[PDB]
Amino acid sequence: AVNGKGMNPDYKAYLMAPLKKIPEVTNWETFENDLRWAKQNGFYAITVDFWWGDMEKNGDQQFDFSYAQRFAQSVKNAGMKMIPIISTHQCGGNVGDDCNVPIPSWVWNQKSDDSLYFKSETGTVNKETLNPLASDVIRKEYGELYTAFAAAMKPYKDVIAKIELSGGPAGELRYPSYTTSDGTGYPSRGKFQAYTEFAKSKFRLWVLNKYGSLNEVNKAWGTKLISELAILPPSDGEQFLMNGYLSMYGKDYLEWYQGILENHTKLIGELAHNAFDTTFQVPIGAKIAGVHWQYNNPTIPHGAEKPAGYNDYSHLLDAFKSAKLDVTFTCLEMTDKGSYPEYSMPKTLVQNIATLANEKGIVLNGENALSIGNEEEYKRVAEMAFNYNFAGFTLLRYQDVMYNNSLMGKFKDLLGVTPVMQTIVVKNVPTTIGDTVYITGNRAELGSWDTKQYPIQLYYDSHSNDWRGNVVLPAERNIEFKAFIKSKDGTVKSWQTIQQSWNPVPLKTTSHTSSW
Ligand SMILES: OC[C@H]1O[C@H](O)[C@H](O)[C@@H](O)[C@@H]1O
Numbered sequence: 190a191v192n193g194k195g196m197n198p199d200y201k202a203y204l205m206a207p208l209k210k211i212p213e214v215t216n217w218e219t220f221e222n223d224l225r226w227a228k229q230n231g232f233y234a235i236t237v238d239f240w241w242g243d244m245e246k247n248g249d250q251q252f253d254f255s256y257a258q259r260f261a262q263s264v265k266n267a268g269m270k271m272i273p274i275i276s277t278h279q280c281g282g283n284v285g286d287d288c289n290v291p292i293p294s295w296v297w298n299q300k301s302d303d304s305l306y307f308k309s310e311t312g313t314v315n316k317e318t319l320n321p322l323a324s325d326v327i328r329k330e331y332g333e334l335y336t337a338f339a340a341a342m343k344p345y346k347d348v349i350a351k352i353e354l355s356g357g358p359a360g361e362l363r364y365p366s367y368t369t370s371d372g373t374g375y376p377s378r379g380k381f382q383a384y385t386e387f388a389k390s391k392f393r394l395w396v397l398n399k400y401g402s403l404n405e406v407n408k409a410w411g412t413k414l415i416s417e418l419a420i421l422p423p424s425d426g427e428q429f430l431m432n433g434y435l436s437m438y439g440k441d442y443l444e445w446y447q448g449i450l451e452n453h454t455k456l457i458g459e460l461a462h463n464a465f466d467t468t469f470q471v472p473i474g475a476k477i478a479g480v481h482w483q484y485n486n487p488t489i490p491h492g493a494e495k496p497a498g499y500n501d502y503s504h505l506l507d508a509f510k511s512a513k514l515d516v517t518f519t520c521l522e523m524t525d526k527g528s529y530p531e532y533s534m535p536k537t538l539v540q541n542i543a544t545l546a547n548e549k550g551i552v553l554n555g556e557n558a559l560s561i562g563n564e565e566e567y568k569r570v571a572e573m574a575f576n577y578n579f580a581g582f583t584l585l586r587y588q589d590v591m592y593n594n595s596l597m598g599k600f601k602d603l604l605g606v607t608p609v610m611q612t613i614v615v616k617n618v619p620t621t622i623g624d625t626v627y628i629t630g631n632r633a634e635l636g637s638w639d640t641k642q643y644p645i646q647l648y649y650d651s652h653s654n655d656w657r658g659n660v661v662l663p664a665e666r667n668i669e670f671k672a673f674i675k676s677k678d679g680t681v682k683s684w685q686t687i688q689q690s691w692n693p694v695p696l697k698t699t700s701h702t703s704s705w
């Protein structure tokens with residue numbers, strides 16, 4: 190892996206359940222057998238959406254957790270674990286959505302202003318999720334929902350391995366900047382979603398708070414605004430994305446815009462920890478979307494990310510570490526293109542996020558954005574997951590592998606692996622002063638024969654005059670590898686004479702000794 194390390198010893202694979210309730214797909218018995226089959230193939234748990242539109246449909250505080258309980262009961266019967274996603278967003282209307290579960294319709298009547306929803310640069314209203322600006326309503330409803338959920342699921346704490354939170358549209362922490370009705374669907378640029386009267390005044394107040402008076406504002410922005418009412422979000426999103434973002438106004442606007450999501454992250458993190466920490470004692474996380482299109486567009490750089498709320502990922506992630514939430518990213522199966530008209534750079538994106546996450550010490554999890562129907566994609570996922578320290582991978586989605594034996598088998602071999610610590614010992618290595626020894630192998634968890642970025646470093650043993658190290662390996666899988674010497678400058682000086690192999694890697698910790 191990167192930095193001479195190996196795969197994450199805590200790696201676990203998860204399976205995303207269908208969007209529709211199980212009884213609308215098959216029966217519970219078959220479901221239980223499907224789970225036992227999944228477990229046999231390396232899946233640790235099944236993650237599932239529990240829709241707010243289902244749990245508090247009739248009215249405020251009129252809960253119904255019977256479905257969530259019946260689902261959990263079956264997960265228990267199968268001897269599996271589950272990861273519930275408290276989906277406080279709408280199901281249906283997004284790419285791949287085969288459901289129709291809006292959030293409770295009564296929530297919209299709790300405000301007379303337009304503080305609860307979104308409005309784009311061109312007036313398109315969006316109600317897939319509550320506007321994070323309405324922190325008073327979010328604090329009340331999410332607060333009540335989480336606590337009620339914890340109480341109702343207390344009997345099933347032993348099957349709950351983790352809890353995922355929904356931070357916005359499609360359960361991702363972002364603005365609904367790419368939708369069909371707003372004319373911003375992939376791969377178009379996104380539109381900013383801060384044009385409700387409420388959003389405009391919040392921005393205005395934020396600016397005035399930072400500068401004190403319109404006079405200081407004009408001085409800081411180099412503008413000549415005639416009155417406080419002139420403080421507004423961009424009038425032309427495209428012109429803003431072309432060069433307006435470079436100005437002091439631009440920096441302030443984007444800071445406030447992304448700031449709304451960071452504060453939201455801290456709020457739901459606090460509500461979630463207060464409601465689950467004592468009862469479940471399990472990790473909690475949220476998701477960041479992989480808005481990979483228009484990444485390297487020369488005309489409108491990061492033309493889709495910025496409107497979605499992503500302008501400074503490093504700053505964004507600090508909010509996660511601060512809220513004590515793990516992060517889940519997407520598009521781990523795609524590769525870079527960066528060509529007109531999509532200007533898509535998914536891999537470069539995932540690499541940047543993973544790097545930042547690791548620096549800050551944030552537990553990183555991944556998912557694939559689109560269904561995988563070929564072994565080649567699993568390989569790319571494996572490359573990113575095992576060489577960028579991912580702690581988990583969730584496969585979207587259930588049916589893709591449950592009704593395709595060959596694909597399921599390829600997932601088990603490549604991704605449904607159990608990491609096991611092993612000692613590698615290499616003797617008779619002709620190292621000179623300054624040289625270092627590394628190992629690299631055929632599988633992704635071994636760097637796929639890469640000697641530049643992914644090799645696994647070994648450590649000289651002065652007492653036995655050999656090189657060794659504890660490496661995390663995929664249990665019960667065949668591997669081939671070779672040690673090599675790297676000069677003090679970074680060039681590969683030589684390789685081990687004979688290629689080594691372990692067919693397969695034992696599941697009990699032991700050691701593999703070979704000679705140069
Ligand atoms: O906009 C939603 C979807 O659009 C396209 O299908 C992209 O390939 C995918 O990554 C994204 O999730």
Ligand SMILES: [Ca+2]
Pocket residue numbers: 245249250329330333334
């Ligand atoms: Ca409520």
